[PDB]
């Protein structure tokens, strides 16, 4: 080859991924209708094994084998941006559901928002703490980025550790707020919009925190250079996305919707 | 486009066999089902 | 070796071939479903004696034709085969993720065929509206298996869209601007942008339906303060872009086929064609509620959706006139692919014009949920997508295979299909104007003559489909090896021979500034 | 910790014809076999589950 | 610089989290649960949940989440 | 405070080859668009190849949307069949 | 991997009669499936 | 109702259905003309051995084939929107009738004065009286006064349905939790038929609508007799 | 009184809030009148309008919820 692009070794992970999707969906079917978790627990396991080996191989191809030329890195930049756009449009559907229900509350709700018998959380208590936590983590991840670019290993690790700690704090606060909430997912469209929108956001915080932990261990093992660290950039972009979705949820559901 | 003559020519008789077998593979199973609908 | 090559592929050509095989198999399923529809309607009374089964057949017909036949063939098959070759790229940007887009579709298809086999199937229509699709009126696993089928097809096409956009932006020769890429490549980039933005909104909506069915949410349930009409907005916010997704790669293939068989180096008005496809893609996001003119929306909302929908005719007209201007002065070669492309131009135009009738909300009150709508979309979508697919298949078969079709057989195939689809769908205009509802298993006696003729048409297209399988067999059976192809100087995908080597453009093209 | 990237670069560039998913050694083969066994076995079980659920 | 973003992390961002942590800390303690009223738009049950007895939400809190029939 | 490797210390494989060639102003992996000569038979466009033929795309005039594609073979200069611009292979 | 006509496909075209059998089964199974699905739903 | 071999719309029963017929004639002329012009131009491009294969300049012609279509769309839009706003205009109804969709039948409520309500089911084929229409007759017709503005309100007590009467130009979706309004005015006495127009499950084909349009005095006596 | 006149507060195809508002207005008025022991006849206009517009099953369900103490509107 006299081009700069990556011809990938034939791989089994696309097939194991596709089959993990089949086992997770048929498993959810088997859990909702046939009172059994077996298929679902096989699908979740094969999904985690697929993700582990696939992203392991990407690290082998880049850090260990040198296939990530500037042209390859530019492609991964576009791929991550486009992935984030698709996730924004997914959240857009839930925000549309929320505004649709809350701007024209039906007679069943008492014709008001919040509905009769719903006692929203105080947005100035734990939801405000959660906002401070994710905004703070957007500052610390930025410190981590500049430390890496400046070649500072210790400060990159401390900043990234702080960022992960804040992600975990957010997740534990949210778990606690779920448990304390006097309303449930079954409390009409208020509970439906609240738990499904904040729940998908919670999942993205766990995914993003996991991605940052992956970057933390790769940094411990010296994988990143001061100039080449796309896994870190991608995790930082994803982390800013999670922050920004939170700001929209906080303003829409917690504050305006209270 | 230009092309070589057939490396393994398919005579008119061979084409009638291929066409017949193709049509039967579509028609017999569907025909069996539709013929037996009353029975189902 | 077989498993490494066909199950573990990282090769755009072999993955394209997997998509074409999958889509052809899907087309046989979708055709069988279509013939069962027309058999139920081919005489007055009941054939199946079970209208839940009729509704399941209608629903599966649409999902198979849209998600397993058209999108895999156009984007997965032609897109994977042609896009890298047309920009001199060595493969797709994400050649391993590309294989997962492919392998998600057999499981998606399996979940759809499971939906039809458990309980009484999903007899919902392909729109899957609650409360009919809810856990009271469709208790049990069928609708959830349909939702999961759509989730896997959705992930397949989202990752595919990321792949195509990245490939087309990032992997052209450095001298090649976006305004030096072929129209087929434009058509795939625009389709990929529509998929990227539209499928996540479908995913959100069908996820809400899943939670209403299984976790006691009430997004669409008025008892909880929900609204069935919210589902319809989310579905059609996806579903209008989806109909442009179904035709755009067809527009791209038609531009190449008309150019090629006119003996031209280039399509008429290249930048106009780029403008038209981008305009259609943008306007395709702001018209969805023309699927909802009878749900009770405000008059001003209806006036807006009527007006915005009609605007799409302007860019679309530029494409139709640009195809005719490409023919103008051509050394016309009457190949079977040219016949498909000319049939496309005519039949697409008829369907597009009945869409402009439907855009008028006032008239749509009377045409909505009638066979007039079924006639509109079988012209513009069914014949449009299928004619472009058959044109592209007969044109590029020798590139993909290294063998020629029998052109006389391929012209016979075209002639039978042209008769069958017009006999099938043209009378459905009369059924719609005269008020026959769609999604019906039986009809008042007055509607018998047109339903009889329509069902007889459906059998003519069956004969064409069976002949098509024989024609593909005859080509592989006879093994006429390609020698020379004309116009390689403006059709880069042919310049590496037939078929091209597994690895092409290992040494990239030389293009200076 | 110490920077051992050079020793991993030597291992993954070794001219042994192995695909990247198996180039780490015997542990890769094991995790591959576990993954594919769970996927193929899981898939056969899902087909059994369909057979079961297809009848009342 | 890293120096500036560290200054912001420790000088503004974490002091904010500490102040909001204080605010939350001071406004915690269980508020009195309201009178149970069996409103038909709440405690929705169209299908049993796929866990427990089918009638308990996933993060059911006996103190503040009534069943369709009232507090446990 | 150091401890982060540089590309100079740790880049490997093709990434390193591209890095080292660029420092020397060389482009063996075709990252840059080549600059045209006058393209006369005396001053042909020089087309590097690792083999005895390579595909040329000719954008005959600035902002043409149509690219003219042809195989350039080792030996005598060949001409773009649209504009007659000369190209010569340098294997 | 084998390159060239009849070699860039997951099915053999070495024998036109075995190929006819394979194409029969492939397209035939797809076209038959819906008829057997209707039969299945009618027999429940 | 439709008659055998019908090509176009049912004859108009209401002034707005008359307006839609004239609007469809205008639009269909344009559809015919454009369809025909495209087929003719295809055939003109394909019927000469004369050639011109060099690069063709596009900008002059692209003006023609954006401006002409823009004008044609405005010539469709103008009468289209006149009719849309005419339907929507304030008419002051004399009577309100509600219909509720169900799997698989319509109920009707006339509650301006008395509590009048009843179910309306398809007559089974095996029970049709000689001369009666398969899949179209109901046991209990929707009796209404002719030559009067009537407010119809449409909802559902289960899944989506859609209340349609083609000869009056009517189609309003029946959505649970929603009350959709339309107006009905028949120029003539008689029987006017329609069919459920939203897929509502296995008997979607078999829950029709029969309006019986009679003088006010007959409507009043029928109403009294139905309590 | 023939039927409910056009109400400029509810000019669109969705008449759900018109039915709801008139049902609330009747029951608010009947409570205000019964409470002072004035005459429920002043409430008659609201009664005629909600009976004209509101589906029987809606009124029936709302009446049952007022008697149960689960009516979510303010009366
Ligand atoms: C969930 C799944 C999500 C997917 C995550 C993707 C990660 C991709 C990383 C990867 O595959 O690389 C490993 C991979 C292992 O090494 P290698 O390429 O296999 O082999 C030679 C290397 O070059 C080695 O060079 P090196 O520079 O990478 O050094 C690595 C290693 C070298 O060791 C070896 O790899 C071989 C040694 C022989 C023994 C093999 C033991 C490993 C067994 C793996 C089991 C994983 C299964 C996961 C699925 C579980 C299903 C329930 O050396 C060690 O001492 C570490 C031991 C192995 C590291 C991985 C351990 C996995 C823990 C579980 C996490 C997955 C979840 O190393 C890399 O390429 C990068 C390593 C750094 C990344 C580790 C990050 C783990 C983070 C886990 C997240 C947990 C989230 C907590 C939730 C909190 C939320 C609020
Ligand atoms: C609801 C589900 C959704 C269904 C989707 C269906 C569509 C799937 C699309 C993908 C097609 C399959 C390809 C992947 C692997 C298939 C496995 C296999 O054995 O294949 C054998 C088979 C051909 O066998 P062959 O001639 O003996 O093998 C030649 C090898 O070179 C010699 O290799 P070897 O000798 O080293 O080893 C080969 C050996 C064993 O090879 C292995 O070691 C492979 C073992 C694992 C294979 C698992 C793959 C499963 C496929 C996915 C579907 C699920 O194969 C066998 O002969 C025995 C295995 C038999 C397995 C049968 C499965 C085939 C596909 C099933 C179709 C749908 C049935 C559904 C039934 C529904 C009824 C209601 O490949 C195919 O399935 C191809 C379809 C049959 C030919 C149709 C030709 C039509 C032409 C149309 C023209 C369109 C293209 C235009 C451009 C052309 C130029 C580029
Ligand atoms: C390959 C071939 C395969 C076979 C194709 C399928 C066969 C269908 C046979 C139809 C024959 C109709 C018939 O019995 O004619 C008696 C019929 C008796 O005349 P009439 O009772 O005075 O009816 C005049 C209507 O009242 C006039 O007023 P209306 O309100 O009754 O008229 C509405 C009617 C008006 O439509 C028609 O009159 C039919 C037009 C047929 C075009 C072919 O329907 C439409 O709107 C049709 C919508 C079509 C969408 C646009 C189609 C673009 C056409 C492409 C142009 C290229 C030309 C070649 O004679 C005809 O007008 C012939 C049609
Ligand atoms: C390939 C797929 C495809 C394409 C491209 C289109 C294109 C268009 N469609 Fe269609 N449509 C569908 C597939 C498609 N449609 C499907 C599947 C449904 C139903 C879904 C369901 O309910 O199941 C549907 C339904 C649908 C409806 C809803 C009807 C109803 O349910 O009541 C409407 C409403 O406006 C609409 C309009 C249009 C219009 C205005 C265009 C325009 O884009 C057409 C533009 C083209 C032309 C106009 C012809 C060429 C132009 C000229 C020659 C220039 C000159 C022309 C003029 C001046 C007019 N279509
Ligand atoms: C691409 C989309 C597509 C295609 C191709 C078709 C094809 C056909 N459709 Fe339709 N159809 C829909 C999309 C499509 N359909 C949708 C979306 C609905 C609405 C469902 C709902 O209401 O919910 C519908 C509904 C619908 C109805 C209305 C049902 C009702 O309202 O009750 C009818 C009635 O006749 C019909 C008939 C047919 C017929 C006879 C064919 C064909 O038989 C016509 C001939 C075409 C072929 C035979 C295709 C052959 C192609 C291949 C075999 C692929 C070959 C592959 C390669 C070469 C690589 N379909
Ligand atoms: C701290 C936040 C972290 C979130 C993780 C927690 C739990 C499971 C995973 C969550 C994933 C996100 C959303 C899915 C939907 C529902 C969960 C919403 C969040 C949540 O956890 O909601 C809880 C309900 O959970 C329930 O039903 C639980 C239901 C569990 C089953 C999940 C169903 C799976 C749905 C399929 C997903 C489809 C994916 C689409 C992909 C797109 C492809 C195109 C709320 O508890 P409660 O007791 O009702 O109220 C509190 C009262 N004290
Ligand atoms: C425990 C909870 C279970 C729930 C399921 C999902 C859970 C966890 C997923 C966590 C995501 C981890 C992703 C780790 C990726 C590691 C590989 C990597 O980061 O690879 C990098 C490339 O980036 C790349 O591929 C970028 C690839 C990025 C992909 C990540 C995107 C997020 C994935 C979301 C997945 C599901 C979302 C579904 C929600 C609907 C490698 O290039 P560099 O870093 O430049 O290194 C090279 C240098 O060393 C040279 O000097
Ligand atoms: C929409 C797609 C369908 C298109 C129409 C299909 C065209 C018909 C193809 C022939 O199908 C066969 O027809 C036979 C009858 O002609 C059937 O034999 C049946 O009838 C015979 C004659 O009575 C008996 O001898 C057999 O036992 C009995 O199975 C046989 O099963 C069936 O396969
Ligand atoms: C690596 C290869 C892949 C591995 C495949 C393994 C397949 C073996 C799974 C065992 O099957 C289980 O059998 C249980 C019965 O013994 C079921 O219990 C469930 O079903 C019971 C049936 O009464 C009920 O009691 C409850 O729903 C529940 O306990 C359960 O659903 C089912 O999964
Ligand atoms: C001593 C060691 C040096 C690592 C190295 O240079 O190889 C240091 C550098 C940065 C340290 C980490 C960061 O300072 C952040 C964390 C600080 C906590 O007090 C302990 C864990 C914690 C996650 C540290 C673990 C470990 O001691 C690290 C990794
Ligand atoms: C590569 C970008 C070219 C932009 C051309 C804009 C003309 C089309 C306008 C409508 C669509 C714009 C969306 C971007
Ligand atoms: Zn040139």
PDB file of N, CA and C in Angstrom, chain C residues 221-275:
ATOM      1  N   UNK C 221     -50.635   6.992  26.249  1.00  0.00           N
ATOM      2  CA  UNK C 221     -51.850   6.514  26.957  1.00  0.00           C
ATOM      3  C   UNK C 221     -52.513   7.701  27.644  1.00  0.00           C
ATOM      4  N   UNK C 222     -53.687   8.154  27.163  1.00  0.00           N
ATOM      5  CA  UNK C 222     -54.380   9.284  27.786  1.00  0.00           C
ATOM      6  C   UNK C 222     -54.683   9.089  29.279  1.00  0.00           C
ATOM      7  N   UNK C 223     -54.853   7.853  29.748  1.00  0.00           N
ATOM      8  CA  UNK C 223     -55.123   7.593  31.186  1.00  0.00           C
ATOM      9  C   UNK C 223     -53.969   8.170  32.036  1.00  0.00           C
ATOM     10  N   UNK C 224     -52.711   8.182  31.555  1.00  0.00           N
ATOM     11  CA  UNK C 224     -51.575   8.780  32.276  1.00  0.00           C
ATOM     12  C   UNK C 224     -51.282  10.208  31.859  1.00  0.00           C
ATOM     13  N   UNK C 225     -52.091  10.818  30.987  1.00  0.00           N
ATOM     14  CA  UNK C 225     -51.800  12.151  30.405  1.00  0.00           C
ATOM     15  C   UNK C 225     -50.993  12.081  29.099  1.00  0.00           C
ATOM     16  N   UNK C 226     -50.808  10.874  28.531  1.00  0.00           N
ATOM     17  CA  UNK C 226     -50.133  10.660  27.242  1.00  0.00           C
ATOM     18  C   UNK C 226     -51.053  10.972  26.067  1.00  0.00           C
ATOM     19  N   UNK C 227     -50.546  10.751  24.862  1.00  0.00           N
ATOM     20  CA  UNK C 227     -51.223  11.165  23.622  1.00  0.00           C
ATOM     21  C   UNK C 227     -50.764  10.240  22.503  1.00  0.00           C
ATOM     22  N   UNK C 228     -51.682   9.426  21.931  1.00  0.00           N
ATOM     23  CA  UNK C 228     -51.363   8.636  20.744  1.00  0.00           C
ATOM     24  C   UNK C 228     -50.772   9.489  19.618  1.00  0.00           C
ATOM     25  N   UNK C 229     -51.177  10.749  19.530  1.00  0.00           N
ATOM     26  CA  UNK C 229     -50.715  11.574  18.387  1.00  0.00           C
ATOM     27  C   UNK C 229     -49.213  11.909  18.554  1.00  0.00           C
ATOM     28  N   UNK C 230     -48.699  11.957  19.792  1.00  0.00           N
ATOM     29  CA  UNK C 230     -47.228  12.149  19.960  1.00  0.00           C
ATOM     30  C   UNK C 230     -46.465  11.016  19.234  1.00  0.00           C
ATOM     31  N   UNK C 231     -46.887   9.749  19.355  1.00  0.00           N
ATOM     32  CA  UNK C 231     -46.219   8.635  18.631  1.00  0.00           C
ATOM     33  C   UNK C 231     -46.167   8.964  17.138  1.00  0.00           C
ATOM     34  N   UNK C 232     -47.274   9.428  16.600  1.00  0.00           N
ATOM     35  CA  UNK C 232     -47.402   9.676  15.141  1.00  0.00           C
ATOM     36  C   UNK C 232     -46.384  10.749  14.726  1.00  0.00           C
ATOM     37  N   UNK C 233     -46.241  11.827  15.489  1.00  0.00           N
ATOM     38  CA  UNK C 233     -45.210  12.852  15.189  1.00  0.00           C
ATOM     39  C   UNK C 233     -43.803  12.235  15.174  1.00  0.00           C
ATOM     40  N   UNK C 234     -43.442  11.470  16.193  1.00  0.00           N
ATOM     41  CA  UNK C 234     -42.085  10.886  16.288  1.00  0.00           C
ATOM     42  C   UNK C 234     -41.890   9.927  15.116  1.00  0.00           C
ATOM     43  N   UNK C 235     -42.877   9.062  14.847  1.00  0.00           N
ATOM     44  CA  UNK C 235     -42.770   8.085  13.736  1.00  0.00           C
ATOM     45  C   UNK C 235     -42.572   8.839  12.416  1.00  0.00           C
ATOM     46  N   UNK C 236     -43.453   9.781  12.102  1.00  0.00           N
ATOM     47  CA  UNK C 236     -43.371  10.430  10.765  1.00  0.00           C
ATOM     48  C   UNK C 236     -42.223  11.438  10.705  1.00  0.00           C
ATOM     49  N   UNK C 237     -41.732  11.934  11.842  1.00  0.00           N
ATOM     50  CA  UNK C 237     -40.515  12.783  11.814  1.00  0.00           C
ATOM     51  C   UNK C 237     -39.381  11.949  11.196  1.00  0.00           C
ATOM     52  N   UNK C 238     -39.370  10.648  11.492  1.00  0.00           N
ATOM     53  CA  UNK C 238     -38.483   9.668  10.836  1.00  0.00           C
ATOM     54  C   UNK C 238     -39.018   9.294   9.444  1.00  0.00           C
ATOM     55  N   UNK C 239     -40.303   8.961   9.366  1.00  0.00           N
ATOM     56  CA  UNK C 239     -40.891   8.277   8.194  1.00  0.00           C
ATOM     57  C   UNK C 239     -40.852   9.129   6.915  1.00  0.00           C
ATOM     58  N   UNK C 240     -40.992  10.459   6.977  1.00  0.00           N
ATOM     59  CA  UNK C 240     -40.836  11.248   5.724  1.00  0.00           C
ATOM     60  C   UNK C 240     -39.378  11.224   5.237  1.00  0.00           C
ATOM     61  N   UNK C 241     -38.373  11.585   6.056  1.00  0.00           N
ATOM     62  CA  UNK C 241     -36.984  11.355   5.652  1.00  0.00           C
ATOM     63  C   UNK C 241     -36.774   9.941   5.103  1.00  0.00           C
ATOM     64  N   UNK C 242     -37.345   8.915   5.752  1.00  0.00           N
ATOM     65  CA  UNK C 242     -37.189   7.516   5.318  1.00  0.00           C
ATOM     66  C   UNK C 242     -37.634   7.382   3.853  1.00  0.00           C
ATOM     67  N   UNK C 243     -38.730   8.033   3.423  1.00  0.00           N
ATOM     68  CA  UNK C 243     -39.135   7.828   2.003  1.00  0.00           C
ATOM     69  C   UNK C 243     -38.117   8.471   1.052  1.00  0.00           C
ATOM     70  N   UNK C 244     -37.478   9.572   1.424  1.00  0.00           N
ATOM     71  CA  UNK C 244     -36.369  10.169   0.626  1.00  0.00           C
ATOM     72  C   UNK C 244     -35.113   9.278   0.688  1.00  0.00           C
ATOM     73  N   UNK C 245     -34.824   8.701   1.842  1.00  0.00           N
ATOM     74  CA  UNK C 245     -33.737   7.699   2.001  1.00  0.00           C
ATOM     75  C   UNK C 245     -33.929   6.546   0.997  1.00  0.00           C
ATOM     76  N   UNK C 246     -35.179   6.131   0.786  1.00  0.00           N
ATOM     77  CA  UNK C 246     -35.514   4.983  -0.098  1.00  0.00           C
ATOM     78  C   UNK C 246     -35.292   5.349  -1.560  1.00  0.00           C
ATOM     79  N   UNK C 247     -35.416   6.621  -1.932  1.00  0.00           N
ATOM     80  CA  UNK C 247     -35.283   6.998  -3.370  1.00  0.00           C
ATOM     81  C   UNK C 247     -33.930   7.648  -3.692  1.00  0.00           C
ATOM     82  N   UNK C 248     -33.259   8.340  -2.755  1.00  0.00           N
ATOM     83  CA  UNK C 248     -32.040   9.127  -3.114  1.00  0.00           C
ATOM     84  C   UNK C 248     -30.954   8.286  -3.801  1.00  0.00           C
ATOM     85  N   UNK C 249     -30.544   7.117  -3.268  1.00  0.00           N
ATOM     86  CA  UNK C 249     -29.547   6.303  -3.961  1.00  0.00           C
ATOM     87  C   UNK C 249     -30.037   5.846  -5.352  1.00  0.00           C
ATOM     88  N   UNK C 250     -31.346   5.666  -5.507  1.00  0.00           N
ATOM     89  CA  UNK C 250     -31.968   5.412  -6.811  1.00  0.00           C
ATOM     90  C   UNK C 250     -31.763   6.584  -7.744  1.00  0.00           C
ATOM     91  N   UNK C 251     -31.993   7.802  -7.275  1.00  0.00           N
ATOM     92  CA  UNK C 251     -31.661   9.023  -8.074  1.00  0.00           C
ATOM     93  C   UNK C 251     -30.196   8.947  -8.535  1.00  0.00           C
ATOM     94  N   UNK C 252     -29.291   8.606  -7.608  1.00  0.00           N
ATOM     95  CA  UNK C 252     -27.863   8.528  -7.923  1.00  0.00           C
ATOM     96  C   UNK C 252     -27.617   7.514  -9.017  1.00  0.00           C
ATOM     97  N   UNK C 253     -28.170   6.302  -8.881  1.00  0.00           N
ATOM     98  CA  UNK C 253     -27.949   5.238  -9.893  1.00  0.00           C
ATOM     99  C   UNK C 253     -28.550   5.672 -11.237  1.00  0.00           C
ATOM    100  N   UNK C 254     -29.707   6.294 -11.241  1.00  0.00           N
ATOM    101  CA  UNK C 254     -30.388   6.733 -12.485  1.00  0.00           C
ATOM    102  C   UNK C 254     -29.496   7.766 -13.186  1.00  0.00           C
ATOM    103  N   UNK C 255     -28.893   8.710 -12.453  1.00  0.00           N
ATOM    104  CA  UNK C 255     -27.980   9.715 -13.067  1.00  0.00           C
ATOM    105  C   UNK C 255     -26.850   8.991 -13.817  1.00  0.00           C
ATOM    106  N   UNK C 256     -26.246   7.960 -13.217  1.00  0.00           N
ATOM    107  CA  UNK C 256     -25.117   7.216 -13.818  1.00  0.00           C
ATOM    108  C   UNK C 256     -25.586   6.423 -15.041  1.00  0.00           C
ATOM    109  N   UNK C 257     -26.717   5.739 -14.941  1.00  0.00           N
ATOM    110  CA  UNK C 257     -27.233   4.851 -16.023  1.00  0.00           C
ATOM    111  C   UNK C 257     -27.642   5.723 -17.218  1.00  0.00           C
ATOM    112  N   UNK C 258     -28.387   6.790 -16.978  1.00  0.00           N
ATOM    113  CA  UNK C 258     -28.830   7.667 -18.100  1.00  0.00           C
ATOM    114  C   UNK C 258     -27.605   8.297 -18.784  1.00  0.00           C
ATOM    115  N   UNK C 259     -26.610   8.705 -18.010  1.00  0.00           N
ATOM    116  CA  UNK C 259     -25.371   9.297 -18.547  1.00  0.00           C
ATOM    117  C   UNK C 259     -24.649   8.272 -19.429  1.00  0.00           C
ATOM    118  N   UNK C 260     -24.436   7.087 -18.866  1.00  0.00           N
ATOM    119  CA  UNK C 260     -23.703   5.984 -19.507  1.00  0.00           C
ATOM    120  C   UNK C 260     -24.393   5.602 -20.821  1.00  0.00           C
ATOM    121  N   UNK C 261     -25.686   5.291 -20.805  1.00  0.00           N
ATOM    122  CA  UNK C 261     -26.336   4.733 -22.016  1.00  0.00           C
ATOM    123  C   UNK C 261     -26.746   5.862 -22.963  1.00  0.00           C
ATOM    124  N   UNK C 262     -26.537   7.112 -22.575  1.00  0.00           N
ATOM    125  CA  UNK C 262     -26.658   8.240 -23.540  1.00  0.00           C
ATOM    126  C   UNK C 262     -25.305   8.453 -24.229  1.00  0.00           C
ATOM    127  N   UNK C 263     -24.260   7.730 -23.808  1.00  0.00           N
ATOM    128  CA  UNK C 263     -22.911   7.935 -24.352  1.00  0.00           C
ATOM    129  C   UNK C 263     -22.314   9.276 -23.947  1.00  0.00           C
ATOM    130  N   UNK C 264     -22.681   9.791 -22.792  1.00  0.00           N
ATOM    131  CA  UNK C 264     -22.181  11.101 -22.309  1.00  0.00           C
ATOM    132  C   UNK C 264     -21.057  10.844 -21.300  1.00  0.00           C
ATOM    133  N   UNK C 265     -20.143  11.815 -21.215  1.00  0.00           N
ATOM    134  CA  UNK C 265     -19.036  11.828 -20.234  1.00  0.00           C
ATOM    135  C   UNK C 265     -19.587  12.271 -18.862  1.00  0.00           C
ATOM    136  N   UNK C 266     -20.730  12.940 -18.830  1.00  0.00           N
ATOM    137  CA  UNK C 266     -21.240  13.637 -17.629  1.00  0.00           C
ATOM    138  C   UNK C 266     -22.751  13.871 -17.720  1.00  0.00           C
ATOM    139  N   UNK C 267     -23.434  13.892 -16.559  1.00  0.00           N
ATOM    140  CA  UNK C 267     -24.845  14.236 -16.496  1.00  0.00           C
ATOM    141  C   UNK C 267     -24.982  15.730 -16.772  1.00  0.00           C
ATOM    142  N   UNK C 268     -26.120  16.102 -17.335  1.00  0.00           N
ATOM    143  CA  UNK C 268     -26.486  17.529 -17.503  1.00  0.00           C
ATOM    144  C   UNK C 268     -26.620  18.182 -16.122  1.00  0.00           C
ATOM    145  N   UNK C 269     -26.003  19.359 -15.971  1.00  0.00           N
ATOM    146  CA  UNK C 269     -26.229  20.250 -14.822  1.00  0.00           C
ATOM    147  C   UNK C 269     -25.813  19.600 -13.503  1.00  0.00           C
ATOM    148  N   UNK C 270     -24.573  19.145 -13.406  1.00  0.00           N
ATOM    149  CA  UNK C 270     -24.036  18.445 -12.204  1.00  0.00           C
ATOM    150  C   UNK C 270     -24.364  19.224 -10.915  1.00  0.00           C
ATOM    151  N   UNK C 271     -24.051  20.527 -10.865  1.00  0.00           N
ATOM    152  CA  UNK C 271     -24.209  21.300  -9.612  1.00  0.00           C
ATOM    153  C   UNK C 271     -25.706  21.420  -9.299  1.00  0.00           C
ATOM    154  N   UNK C 272     -26.573  21.580 -10.306  1.00  0.00           N
ATOM    155  CA  UNK C 272     -28.034  21.542 -10.115  1.00  0.00           C
ATOM    156  C   UNK C 272     -28.501  20.236  -9.483  1.00  0.00           C
ATOM    157  N   UNK C 273     -27.910  19.122  -9.889  1.00  0.00           N
ATOM    158  CA  UNK C 273     -28.280  17.768  -9.375  1.00  0.00           C
ATOM    159  C   UNK C 273     -27.861  17.660  -7.903  1.00  0.00           C
ATOM    160  N   UNK C 274     -26.689  18.202  -7.565  1.00  0.00           N
ATOM    161  CA  UNK C 274     -26.185  18.255  -6.170  1.00  0.00           C
ATOM    162  C   UNK C 274     -27.139  19.148  -5.374  1.00  0.00           C
ATOM    163  N   UNK C 275     -27.428  20.347  -5.888  1.00  0.00           N
ATOM    164  CA  UNK C 275     -28.369  21.283  -5.258  1.00  0.00           C
ATOM    165  C   UNK C 275     -29.707  20.594  -5.005  1.00  0.00           C
TER     166      UNK C 275
END
